[PDB]
Design a protein around this nucleic acid. Structure first.
Lengths: 134, 122, 69, 375, 153, 120
RNA sequence: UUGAAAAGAACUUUGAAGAGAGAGUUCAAGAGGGCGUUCAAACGAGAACUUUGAAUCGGGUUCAGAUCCCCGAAUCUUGGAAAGCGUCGCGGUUCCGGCGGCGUAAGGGCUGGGUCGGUCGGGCUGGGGCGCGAAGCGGGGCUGGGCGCGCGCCGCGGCUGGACGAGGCGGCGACUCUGGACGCGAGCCGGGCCCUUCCCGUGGAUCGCCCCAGCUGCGGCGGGCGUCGCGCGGCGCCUCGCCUCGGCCGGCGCCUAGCAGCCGACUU
RNA sequence: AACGCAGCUAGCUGCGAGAAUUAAUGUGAAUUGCAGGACACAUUGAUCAUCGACACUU
């Protein structure tokens, strides 16, 4: 179950540590999986979402195979905006629909120097998990 | 330009006062350009100048106080802010040297009769 | 405002270093000469108009002379 | 009632007489540019040549109104419109490869011609223009032909507006939100039956719908941004004002009354600049109160992001019973701009492609009308 | 349309009340755009805003009657409603007679018609309400002098 | 005949009083002046009845700090702009600022001083 | 406590509006923002009620502050008329929101209670001097004649722009009129300068006055007699009609049961 | 306790004329109602947390 007396299994406290959590911890709540092929180039399973990286929806009304990149990450409302996922406002103008980052898979990773750490930090920790089985 | 704080920390006082009192000119100009309608290209700069004037003054004061610590190091008395301020009742506490002084009678009873490490079998 | 009765002590009160201006007003009957100083506006009231054109000519230089007629 | 329409000969002759003097001074001033020519000197040179040849013509008759309708505006790369600098303002020595937009207008008898053009400083005759400059300039030029050929009587503002959107975003550029291309009439530089582009929801809910009619003279302005299409002023001083006639307010300050009376004695409801008063201090501290109490509408200089390129084309057009007719056109060579992006909507390709082979003569459209019943 | 402003400024520059301020009801629009004092003053020399004359409170009803009460036409027994001490104070009449009689008795002292030994006698005669008025004191002196000038004979 | 007292009351004698000469200063550095010239004057006014003052009365009007007296206002307008101040007036306005009516010298003109500042 | 997400209701239509009727979003609007005194006129849509009209001091100033701001003075006359105010007039319509004229029965009090000669304020005259129309001097300029000058009225000439008719089994050239602007024919007529001349300023004479010189009287009126005139008039005496121009001094002169005039109050 | 501080700000909140924060250390691409402007992301860093430096009107 949970054998730690200093973390809580409480409902109303787990919800308060979520809905007004600070915005750098709120970054890693908004994580997202990878494809089944990009878990083989790297050795990572999930990774926090970024401003500009190609992604696709897998659940919901906009379910499709269209690799459209992220164009805004909006942590105040726990949501991201996709390029070719919009919605015709009745006015004539066109707004975006926001979707949750647990519902999208990343098929292209915006890679620079800060990603190469956290993609190698999560990679080294999964070989240490395989030497405790010998 | 980029008014970086660690950049400023190698300089003398005159160019830290030079770069201050002209940054205090543009802040006065934007307050002129705020009472005449203005424009957000000018009025989103008011915070940029203010938090830069705050940045130059801290690099002055952190370097000023740094020289006062270097000057009163080996002194019997330091001024009443250059001496530490943990809390009030932890300054009334005895110093380390006097926190464990034993009388000459006391350190004879600890010399002749030390606590032995014994062990009782059964 | 003091009133100067005689002409001779009007020229010296006008040629002081602090006397700023002279303003001449020609009324119907007489001519009043007014000299502004630091503390007082001194007034010379004189009626003989042949002397009033003499006195305007007999004034020290560098002293403002704006007539009021 | 009293004011004549374009139903007379001399009226259209005065429209020609304004448009060609604007074209003559515009071509001479474009050719008279180089890397380095002072913008203030250019605006002086433009208003000097307009005053010079306005003093040349029609001087037998002492009461005819003619002269500077819209003063000379010389904008920059980032800049948007209406930049006429002052003496105490800071002037830009021009430089190789800079987007220069030249705008000016001339009125005859209360009949107004306005013309603006956009090009590049000192691209040589063997050298050619590339990149995002060429993208946004060919964007605005295809928006110019889309206005030139999508305005016909019976339409609305909506068709040309929402075809400009597709042209500029097939160039992946954006029309700036909230401009008005104006209705011209007798001594009226702006009526109400206008053209919006890219409107926000209050300014299009309140933009009253209308229909292009016959015997009608419109000025079309196109300002396409190579960025977001959301321009705003930056604190640069507005030096161009016009007098709004219906407003009545008696100014309390003596300075502003002297200013507003000199405006009446020099130009009635015509746009003007603050250089003309040559003691500008008194004019500035009068024009503060005048602009506050709605007595002079300003022409606010706008900018955009650092690194932008906003292209402008303004021309008037005349509605005959034949339809719209071009009377002024800025001197443009579309071949020199190399833009990889262009309009890709195939119907809009054929729509803009149709009129390219049409601009051959203005009499071939009526010459073949006798041949229609021939076979 | 609404001229509460222009009525108020007009009464200031005319230095009168708002009762006496006439606005021209035909040229309402020229008056109505007047937001300052100088623009009010402009409309006063141009004759649109006029200070009305004072209403008439003439004194002709009450000055004819003064000329008839100067003669005593309205005094009577039954038009008076104060005491004879309240109408004309009886101290003031005594305080008048003693001015009149002592001054004429002082006229005869330095004009040498009476000596001191009669002036100081007749002064106490005036004090004791002996002499009714001036034409009684005067010929009482003439009879008093003649017999005293006859005691010299 | 030397220890003599002709005064019937023993008044306390006057003993010597030394002055302070401390071993160490109480506070580290002298504090920096926070109400300098650039913090006296906050912004100038541009309202329409403030514009009856520049031409028609030869004066600027600023919004100055409440902790500033008329000598500190006069020393500031001269220091920022290199000009000559005739007299200053003040009133604390009901918003809570302090509106100063600084009048320039008659040799100078406030139409050109407001030109260099920028409310013109 | 809307809803998963604001996709929070485009557009049309009645109304001045709040409010509706179609339309649209949504699985859902049975989820639509706390949602599971009289009369007349004016402005306005609308009028018993709104607005307009009739029944340490002085001066200025604002939409709102002034003994605080500006200007000026400070701690009968100077201030003082250059300011206010009352009128009258010109210019001008957000410079104009500026400027000039003219004005400011009984009840009391005041003076003298006087004649005449000398002196003085004086009043008057002679010598000399002062102001001036005008002859004349310095001259300014709506006069009388000439000249550059209106970039004129009327008509003519040439240039250039515009427009139009006509035509081909998408192809281009020709013809004509007028507008601008100039020059021409002074045919026409309006505004300024040069000479005597229109016109004021200055000095001397008459004329009017004053200084010096001469006396304490000079200037003026009405009736009878005489009476003449080139609108203007006039003269000499007597006067029981006159003002004796008045003050001081000095022979000189006494109202004395007190007058003469002038003003002025309200009372019984 | 009082009073002040935001480009658009009244309340709550935060802060003290360096005034919805400065520096340093982690972290590593945003804050967000509208805008604006930084930000090669190692020629140094938006943001949030921390908090040991500096500052702290009456």
């Amino acid at each position: 179950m949970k054998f730690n007396p200093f973390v809580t299994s409480d409902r109303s406290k787990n919800r308060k540590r979520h809905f007004n959590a600070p915005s750098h911890i709120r970054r890693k709540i908004m994580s997202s999986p990878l494809s089944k092929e990009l878990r083989q180039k790297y050795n990572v399973r999930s990774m926090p979402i970024r401003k500009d990286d190609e992604v696709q929806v897998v659940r919901g009304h906009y379910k499709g195979q269209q690799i459209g990149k992220v164009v805004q990450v909006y942590r105040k409302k726990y949501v991201i905006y996709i390029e070719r996922v919009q919605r015709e406002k009745a006015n004539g103008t066109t707004v975006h629909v926001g979707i949750h980052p647990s519902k999208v898979v990343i098929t292209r990773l915006k890679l620079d120097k800060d990603r190469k750490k956290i993609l190698e930090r999560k990679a080294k920790s999964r070989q240490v998990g395989k030497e405790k089985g010998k | 330009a980029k008014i970086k704080a660690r950049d400023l920390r190698g300089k003398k006082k005159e160019e830290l006062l030079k770069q201050l009192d002209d940054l205090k000119v543009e802040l006065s100009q934007l307050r002129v350009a705020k009472v005449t309608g203005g424009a957000a290209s000018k009025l989103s700069k008011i915070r940029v100048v203010r938090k830069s004037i705050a940045r130059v003054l801290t690099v002055i004061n952190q370097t000023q106080k740094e020289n006062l610590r270097k000057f009163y190091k080996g002194k019997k008395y330091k001024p009443l802010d250059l001496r530490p301020k943990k809390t009030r009742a932890m300054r009334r506490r005895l110093n380390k040297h006097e926190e464990n002084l034993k009388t000459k009678k006391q350190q004879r009873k600890e010399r002749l009769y030390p606590l032995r490490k014994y062990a009782v079998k059964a | 405002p003091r009133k100067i009765e005689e002409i001779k002590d009007f020229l010296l009160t006008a040629r002081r270093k602090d006397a700023k201006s002279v303003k001449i007003k020609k009324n119907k009957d007489n001519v009043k000469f007014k000299v502004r100083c630091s503390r007082y506006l001194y007034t010379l009231v004189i009626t003989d108009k042949e002397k009033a054109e003499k006195l305007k000519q007999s004034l020290p230089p560098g002293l403002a002379v704006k007539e009021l007629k | 009632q009293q004011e004549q329409t374009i139903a007379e000969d001399l009226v259209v002759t005065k429209y020609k007489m304004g448009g060609d003097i604007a074209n003559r001074v515009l071509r001479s001033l474009v050719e008279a540019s180089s890397s380095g020519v002072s913008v203030l000197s250019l605006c002086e040179k433009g208003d000097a040549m307009i005053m010079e040849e306005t003093g040349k013509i029609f001087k037998k008759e002492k009461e005819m109104k003619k002269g500077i309708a819209f003063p000379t505006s010389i904008s920059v790369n980032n800049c948007v419109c209406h930049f006429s600098p002052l003496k105490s303002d800071q002037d830009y020595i021009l430089k190789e490869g800079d987007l220069v937009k030249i705008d000016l207008g001339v009125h005859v008898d209360g009949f107004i011609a306005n013309v603006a053009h956009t090009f590049v400083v000192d691209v040589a005759q063997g050298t050619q223009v590339t990149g995002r400059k060429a993208d946004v300039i060919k964007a605005a030029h295809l928006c110019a032909e889309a206005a030139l050929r999508l305005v016909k009587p019976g339409n609305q503002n909506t068709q040309v507006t929402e075809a400009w959107n597709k042209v500029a975003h097939s160039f992946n550029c954006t029309p700036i939100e909230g401009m008005l291309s104006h209705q011209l009439k007798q001594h009226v530089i702006d009526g109400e039956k206008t053209i919006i582009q890219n409107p926000t929801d209050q300014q299009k809910k309140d933009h009253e719908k209308a229909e292009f009619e016959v015997h009608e003279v419109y000025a079309v302005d196109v300002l396409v941004s190579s960025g977001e299409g959301k321009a705003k002023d930056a604190g640069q001083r507005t030096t161009i004002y016009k007098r709004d006639p219906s407003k009545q307010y008696g100014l309390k300050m003596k300075t502003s009354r002297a200013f507003f009376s000199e405006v009446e004695r020099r130009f009635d409801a015509m746009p003007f600049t603050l250089r003309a008063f040559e003691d500008e201090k008194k004019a500035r501290m009068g024009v503060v109160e005048c602009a506050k109490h709605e007595l002079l509408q300003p022409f606010n200089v706008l900018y955009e992001k650092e690194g932008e390129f906003v292209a402008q084309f303004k021309f008037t057009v005349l509605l005959m019973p034949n339809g719209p007719m071009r009377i002024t056109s800025g001197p443009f060579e579309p071949d020199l701009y190399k833009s990889e992006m262009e309009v890709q909507d195939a119907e809009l390709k054929a729509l803009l492609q149709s009129s390219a082979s049409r601009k051959t003569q203005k009499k071939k459209k009526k010459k073949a009308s006798k041949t229609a019943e021939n076979a | 349309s609404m001229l509460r402003l222009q009525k108020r400024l007009a009464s200031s520059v005319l230095r009168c009340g708002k009762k006496k301020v006439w606005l021209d009801p035909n040229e309402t629009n020229e008056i109505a755009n007047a937001n300052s004092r100088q623009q009010i003053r402009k409309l006063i020399k141009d004759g649109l805003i006029i200070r009305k004359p004072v209403t008439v409170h003439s004194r002709a009803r009450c000055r004819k009657n003064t000329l008839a009460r100067r003669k005593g036409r309205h005094m009577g027994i039954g038009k008076r409603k104060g005491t004879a001490n309240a109408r004309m104070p009886e101290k003031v009449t005594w305080m008048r007679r003693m001015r009149i009689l002592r001054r004429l008795l002082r006229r005869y002292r330095e004009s040498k018609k009476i000596d001191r030994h009669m002036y100081h006698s007749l002064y106490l005669k005036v004090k004791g309400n002996v002499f009714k008025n001036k034409r009684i004191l005067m010929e009482h002196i003439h009879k008093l002098k003649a017999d005293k000038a006859r005691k010299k004979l | 005949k030397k220890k003599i007292r002709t005064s019937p009351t023993f008044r306390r004698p006057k003993t010597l009083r030394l002055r302070r000469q401390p071993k160490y200063p109480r506070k580290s550095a002298p504090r920096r002046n926070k109400l300098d010239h650039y913090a006296i004057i906050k912004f100038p006014l541009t309202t329409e009845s403030a514009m009856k003052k520049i031409e028609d009365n030869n004066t600027l009007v600023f919004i100055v700090d409440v902790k500033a007296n008329k000598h500190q206002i006069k020393q500031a307008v001269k220091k920022l702009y290199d000009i000559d101040v005739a007299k200053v007036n003040t009133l604390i306005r009901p918003d809570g600022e302090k509106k100063a009516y600084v009048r320039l010298a008659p040799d100078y003109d406030a139409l050109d001083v407001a030109n260099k500042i920028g409310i013109i």
